[PDB]
Unconditional design. Sequence first.
Lengths: 121, 121, 121, 121
Amino acid sequence: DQAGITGTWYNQLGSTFIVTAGADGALTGTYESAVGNAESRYVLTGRYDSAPATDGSGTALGWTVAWKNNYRNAHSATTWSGQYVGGAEARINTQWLLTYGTTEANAWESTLVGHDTFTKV
Amino acid sequence: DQAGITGTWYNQLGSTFIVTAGADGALTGTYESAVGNAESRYVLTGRYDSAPATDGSGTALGWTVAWKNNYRNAHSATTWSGQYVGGAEARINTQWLLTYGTTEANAWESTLVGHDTFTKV
Amino acid sequence: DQAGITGTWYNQLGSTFIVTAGADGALTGTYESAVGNAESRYVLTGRYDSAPATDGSGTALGWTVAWKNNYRNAHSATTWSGQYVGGAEARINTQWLLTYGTTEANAWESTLVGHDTFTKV
Amino acid sequence: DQAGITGTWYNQLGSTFIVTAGADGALTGTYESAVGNAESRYVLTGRYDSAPATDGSGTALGWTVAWKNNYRNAHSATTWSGQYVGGAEARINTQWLLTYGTTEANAWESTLVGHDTFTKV
Ligand SMILES: [Cl-]
Ligand SMILES: [Cl-]
Ligand SMILES: [Cl-]
Ligand SMILES: [Cl-]
Ligand SMILES: [Cl-]
Ligand SMILES: [Cl-]
Ligand SMILES: [Cl-]
Ligand SMILES: [Cl-]
Ligand SMILES: [Rh+3]
Ligand SMILES: [Rh+3]
Ligand SMILES: [Rh+3]
Ligand SMILES: [Rh+3]
Ligand SMILES: [Rh+3]
Ligand SMILES: [Rh+3]
Ligand SMILES: [Rh+3]
Ligand SMILES: [Rh+3]
């Protein structure tokens, strides 16, 4: 649990997700994206399942990054929702939703969707 | 921005979402689902845009709930991703993602997608 | 099942969705968006469950619109995926996905997600 | 356009998507999934952009499969929404929504989301 997820992961875009698993389920750390209106690190927070199953299933988790730091504000936030798989090629497989603040008139087009896969190399 | 988010919020299912918005952009609270493999409050955390634009744009935000508490463990996690719209009929408009831990053969079906709209009611 | 789907349907944006449901499970028609880079009818096609269960369950269905007609080309496509619920206040409840053609560097942001609920109005 | 997309593709699960691009934008063919309540082929229909851009961007497309054939009915339908990329390693990169028919009471959990990548080998 804690041991697996805690640390540095990298997705297929080159972004760098540096997280610490609390013992109770807390997720805390930072996020630097390779693309988008984004530069340097951003704060992130979320949760994972701290007593996950033994049947060889992944560990369900989820975190969120609001795209504002000491450099820029993108008026957006994405949530990654996924599950952590251990073993030889450990991965965190996710899908995500990026909502950016709009007027009610562009609400229809406020949310992008996607998938990021995170490995340790 | 920080008063308008903070407090109790109810989605279209009857779920109760109690959240505190810090001044940095941090979200903390509890979520209680009306539906699903859930009962009582579950801890939540998220992030939001503490400097949203001043143009009638909503305020982007995310948060996560891992469906484990003292009472049960659904081995799953939801992230909600949307925007907050203040004023007379303030709402929090989300789309969400729920991943449950599955086996590798079952990963293709591990994730539900939906939308929740929250009102102060 | 085939009468209840066929006809004119309006989402929460004012868009008009004219569809014919064949007896095999086929959907044909036109879609006219109230929003976006669109104007006049666009051709649509989809599929539905022509033997939905008899247990109060809705009727699964999908359809696609490529945003090219005689008038303009947004180089993009939406699929709607939901269920039809008959009776007094019949609705078609969708979530949708809109992909626009992008470059490879831009693929991560090529896809919008949303929901549309259709009423006979 | 037509030339690229028309034919046989395979996703990362082993499913077999056999499609024909109309000259106007029509998509027609069959779908055999490796997983899920699915056996043999199912009819599919959809649309792609028939005059796509020249700037090296993908071709936006979308299709739908209702999971009923002469063998079984899964009371579900998925829509794939994505874009076709030509060149050496041609791919159709998609995300999808599988909605299954539910009572209004399980509507919240009626729709799964995912991503399939289709290549020619
Ligand atoms: Cl279990
Ligand atoms: Cl993967
Ligand atoms: Cl600002
Ligand atoms: Cl809405
Ligand atoms: Cl049946
Ligand atoms: Cl709804
Ligand atoms: Cl162009
Ligand atoms: Cl890919
Ligand atoms: Rh258990
Ligand atoms: Rh991929
Ligand atoms: Rh600004
Ligand atoms: Rh809504
Ligand atoms: Rh049946
Ligand atoms: Rh709704
Ligand atoms: Rh053009
Ligand atoms: Rh993948």
